Design a protein around this ligand. Structure first.
Ligand SMILES: CC(=O)Nc1cccc2cc[nH]c12
Lengths: 178, 235
């Protein structure tokens, strides 16, 4: 088993902590959803290859520009997260997170991940967004953003229903192996 | 870590740690507050355990088994004794606050009503100045500790065999040398997340809401100070 390091980046409300928790437990917590994620080393077998995937979160470091890059050394794959119920978090991807990840992690593949894809069918989400002249992120907007920033690929998931979560992490493992 | 505290913090939440007949006696708002307080102590116990692996297993193990150049071990584990002192003291106060709150006849049923006062004390005065100074030093030496570790692992067979040996148990899976360093660096930015969610569920007693709001402002002032005092050292 080879050792690979994954770092998840994105705005505070992008659901990155929830995505790591649901993957590491292989379950959406039924009694309590933890506030924080420490680290985790997943035993993953993708396309016949066994890999140890150490998982890291950047939550809490969004305001500390000198502390935050200390999470980047030796990263093999970056998950760049945005929330489908938040078009403003998608707009911050090319001008804030992408130049930072390219400077500190040159030649590291980035997977652009659209989180909370369940909220694209939420009536409360669609109503709250319409009051600010907005709507949930469409799949083509996510793909066009992933194309614009030169991402390895574009993926969507729902940490709440577990849909697409295993696939994102098996793809990240494959990306880390190239 | 000691079996006593490991068992008191083995459950996934406060609602699962206490007896269900005790849980049934409390309002949902109290349970929500207590679950987040339990997570703060549980992660503080884990952070102190991480610092003990760095000082007793890694640092001391290298001093007693290897023939490393003087000052090399210090460069791999900067400020670990100072950090271990700061956090073992804070953990002791958190565990004592829980112990005083236990019901008679019980080693698991408790409700912590006052945490803000404890948090203001840790994040103000001399203790805050010692955390600011120690984290500004630690995080400035972070990159050099990693580079030095990678240099020794690839060039020294004895260092490689020492590392492979002391990190072989399953309990150390997510606790290698580089993992311990990043776990320590990331700890300070977890506090505002934990305190803000405790504050979200502590509006019942106005004194407590005010104390938690002050504690949150102090942790953020500390974080901004540590962030401003950092500059990576290069070897
Ligand atoms: C920004 C980014 O994703 N860069 C990158 C690095 C290494 C491989 C790939 C494959 C697509 N993109 C790659």
């Amino acid at each position: 088993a080879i050792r690979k390091k994954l770092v998840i980046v994105g705005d505070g409300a992008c659901g990155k902590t929830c995505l790591l928790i649901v993957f590491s437990k292989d379950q959406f917590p039924e009694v309590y959803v933890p506030t924080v994620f420490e680290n985790y080393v997943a035993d993953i077998e993708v396309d016949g290859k066994q890999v140890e995937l150490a998982l890291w979160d950047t939550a809490g470091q969004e305001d500390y520009d000198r502390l935050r890059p200390l999470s980047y050394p030796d990263t093999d794959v970056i998950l760049m997260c945005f929330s489908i119920d938040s078009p403003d978090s998608l707009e911050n991807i090319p001008e804030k997170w992408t130049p930072e990840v390219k400077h500190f992690c040159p030649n590291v593949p980035i997977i652009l991940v659209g989180n909370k894809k369940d909220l694209r069918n939420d009536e409360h989400t669609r109503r709250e967004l319409a009051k600010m002249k907005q709507e949930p992120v469409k799949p083509e907007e996510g793909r066009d953003m992933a194309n614009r920033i030169g991402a390895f690929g574009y993926m969507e998931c729902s940490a709440k229903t577990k849909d697409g979560v295993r696939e994102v992490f098996e793809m990240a493992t494959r990306a880390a192996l190239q | 870590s000691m079996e006593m505290d490991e068992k008191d913090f083995a459950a996934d939440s406060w609602s699962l740690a206490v007896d269900s007949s005790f849980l049934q006696q409390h309002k949902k708002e109290v349970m929500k507050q207590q679950d987040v307080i339990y997570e703060l102590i549980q992660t503080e116990l884990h952070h102190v355990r991480t610092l003990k692996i760095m000082t007793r297993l890694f640092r001391t193990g290298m001093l007693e088994e290897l023939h490393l150049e003087p000052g090399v071990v210090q460069g791999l584990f900067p400020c670990v004794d100072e950090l271990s002192d700061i956090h073992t003291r804070f953990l002791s106060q958190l565990l004592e606050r829980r112990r005083q709150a236990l019901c008679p006849g019980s080693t698991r049923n408790f409700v912590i009503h006052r945490l803000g006062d404890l948090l203001i004390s840790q994040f103000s005065g001399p203790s805050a100045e010692q955390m600011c100074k120690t984290y500004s030093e630690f995080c400035s030496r972070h990159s050099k500790a990693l580079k030095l570790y990678k240099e020794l692992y690839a060039r020294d067979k004895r260092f490689q065999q020492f590392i492979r040996k002391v990190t072989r148990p399953a309990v150390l899976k997510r606790h290698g040398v580089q993992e311990c360093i990043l776990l320590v660096t990331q700890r300070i930015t977890k506090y505002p997340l934990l305190i803000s969610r405790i504050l979200q569920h502590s509006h019942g007693i106005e004194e407590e809401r005010q104390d938690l709001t002050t504690a949150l402002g102090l942790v953020k002032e500390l974080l901004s100070n540590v962030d401003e005092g950092i500059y990576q050292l290069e070897k």
